[PDB]
Design brief:
The structure is cut from a larger assembly and holds 2 copies of chain A (49 residues).
Chain A (H helix, E strand, L loop, with lengths): L1 H31 L17
PDB class: viral protein/hydrolase
Keywords: viral protein, VIRAL PROTEIN-HYDROLASE complex
Entry title: SARS-CoV-2 Spike Glycoprotein with two ACE2 Bound
């Protein structure tokens, strides 16, 4: 009952990290490899690089 | 006799609760200042009242 609780928490945690890894790859695409015009997505201000 | 489950359940619900204010902060508190309209409604014929 202790491992099923730990593993259920790691599966939920890893989904929060997944959402953050998907967001990090989405910034590294649009925000580093480009110049995204999406307001406040890429620092406060107008985004240069 | 069942160990840390008690605390693990209290900690987990506290983790959710303390996040609901991170959600409410990041959705609404994006604006640095309390901006206000002038009292007179000279908005081109558009009626935001």
């Amino acid at each position: 009952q202790s491992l099923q609780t730990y593993v259920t928490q790691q599966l939920i945690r890893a989904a929060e990290i997944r959402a953050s890894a998907n967001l990090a790859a989405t910034k590294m695409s649009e925000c580093v490899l480009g110049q995204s015009k999406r307001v406040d997505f890429c620092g406060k201000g107008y985004h240069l690089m | 006799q069942y160990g840390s489950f008690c605390t693990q359940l209290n900690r987990a619900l506290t983790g959710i609760a303390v996040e609901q204010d991170k959600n409410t902060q990041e959705v609404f508190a994006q604006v640095k200042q309390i901006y206000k309209t002038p009292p007179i409604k000279d908005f081109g014929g558009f009626n935001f009242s």
